[model samples]
Target chain A: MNPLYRAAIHQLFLALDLPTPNDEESVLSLQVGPHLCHLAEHPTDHLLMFTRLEGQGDATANEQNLFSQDPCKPILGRDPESGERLLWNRQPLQLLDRAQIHHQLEQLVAAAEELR
Target chain B: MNPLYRAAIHQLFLALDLPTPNDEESVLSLQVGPHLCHLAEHPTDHLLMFTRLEGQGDATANEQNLFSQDPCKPILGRDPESGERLLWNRQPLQLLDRAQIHHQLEQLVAAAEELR
Candidate 1:
């Protein structure tokens, strides 16, 4: 496992008061508000955070345009297999600490909820 | 202009060793490598940074999928006016400092260059 991601996971667990996953685990899933969020290790020194948008269909062009225009700029995508809409973000592991991890997750949840 | 964005713009200018823009200006355009990058004040407490992808057409589904899978996860969009392809990212102003500003700009430039 990448050290930076390991440290970030540690911080994330600490921030949420949850037990940190062992080094062998590359992805962890947790609940924030009413959303299920995943923090996964990336190929590089980054962390990928994403959540499925339940009951949402493929993002329309207008929806994409609105998201592109939004200040928060969440990336809306689809799961190729399940075809479920997804809201995601990626950040370098080094850029995140406990507070940032919490903040990003909250932002993801807020964006997901707003779209529903 | 947002104070947090103002401070971030100041730090960005400092990091690039360029003269800072006036407070009245909400967007600053600068060159990094061969790309023209824009850092604009977002409606919320976020900062939006984007660059045009020269010589690139609208991103295809495969391209979007690849980008979505990448560790850096750069958002690919189209300009409403010219329809030129764009790559962008947004961050909360509070999360950025001088070092982060420099880092994000570099990452943006790298991603833009890679897409070409």
Candidate 2:
């Protein structure tokens, strides 16, 4: 896992007033409104972010499409078969300063708010 | 269009080494990869960004999905003047926008040449 990339994400989340993440092999989790946002690092240096929506029956199945119709397009895709998870990630925005970092997170907050 | 927001977008582009825009009621353009990105403002202060994909069949239809699937959330469904244009706007990113008013204009000398 790329420590520096993960650290950058952690710092950005902290700057946005989110709670600390669980560093289980460089995976971080934080609550955004009613959802749980998980930030994990791919061994190849890519950072991945996924969110699990909270509550309701067959909650896992519900999760699959919760974000599909979201114009925000947070999910990368649904699980191949069960379609349980809404996987989503982004290319690095190449933030040049604190304002860009904050701007990115603020956008995430707004997207997550729409879920709630 | 909100002039203040338009000015902020111009400032950010200047910092990023992009070209100046024609201020026909607050619309700005920049080249990204092989595409030209246009940033404009809606009557309600929402910033809309769209790119005209260079070349190909039924270009406008292709244009629709070029961004529909771009993971970067830049479009918004705000007051779009054209029925066919995608509204990729970050309401708050526009708020946190900045740049030292072309302090990096010097860097663009090389970038401008590359565009030729």
Candidate 3:
């Protein structure tokens, strides 16, 4: 929504050396590691967002369907191999909480600076 | 890529009560909890996928600019509060691993029957 988040996502791409979508149709797309995800929108109202995946035969056989009650919170979905999230263009929660945002930004600055 | 993976993604939607995209336009879109994500594709060539956000000011502030050296493994991006991935239409890695798939499905059926 804002530039900072956009900047972060961009940083993610830069870090990964991945190509971004042609959002000029006023759309957004991404190659989230091995999968693909996209966003669709009308003049103002949002149309939809999608993740493009290759046909996976064994996908359903081993995943845990996690559930949560609150809409404000997110449930952690993990990949077994690296035990991480396969995110390319997904939104994060702390962006809206001012205090949380402050908290996260500090962490980001720290992580970035750590590499420096 | 195969039905098993698609089935798993489908099961994920059913387990969570989320909607899939109108891929009739051959596209996929979703509201994954609070964030929106979409998939874009052409007839044969893959298009792009995106994550829709409401605009984040401090989004860049705190998130760890996580990195990985391999394409086979995914990097873990976490939220401070829940420490999870925000996926409406993002792909999960194990979807491609056969042994992993069998393990996950058994877990799912087990989890499902447990609630029963």
Off-target runs (Cα >4 Å) in candidate 2 are: A16-23, A41-48, A53-99, B1-116
How far does residue B114 in candidate 2 sit from its true spot (Å)? 31
* B83 Cα displacement, candidate 2 (Å): 5.2
Instruction: Assess each model's interface with DockQ, reporting 2 decimals per model.
Output: 0.15, 0.04, 0.03
- lDDT per residue as tens, model 2, B1-116: 35666666667766776764555656666665554555555434444455432222222221221222323333212122332222233332334445422322222222222221
lDDT, candidate 1, A1-116, per-residue tens: 78888888889888888888897767888887778988887646667778877765443322352224343245676656765667776665666668777777777777777874
Model 1 misplaced regions, further than 4 Å: A1-48, A51-87, A90-116, B55-58, B62-73
**Local accuracy of candidate 3 as per-residue lDDT tens digits, A1-116:** 54444444444444545664333553555444443444333212212223322332222211121112211122123244553432222224223333433333233233222221
lDDT tens digits by residue: candidate 2, A1-116: 35557566767667877665645566666676656776654424334456643322232212222222222344323343453334344334333244544554454555555654
Write candidate 1's Cα lDDT for B41-90 as tens digits.
66476677888776644353223432254433456666666867677766
Q: Using lDDT as the measure, which candidate wins?
A: 1
Clashing pairs in 1: none
lDDT of 2 at B8: 66
- What 10-residue stretch in candidate 1 chain A is worst by lDDT? A58-67
Q: lDDT of all predictions, in order shown?
A: 0.69, 0.42, 0.32
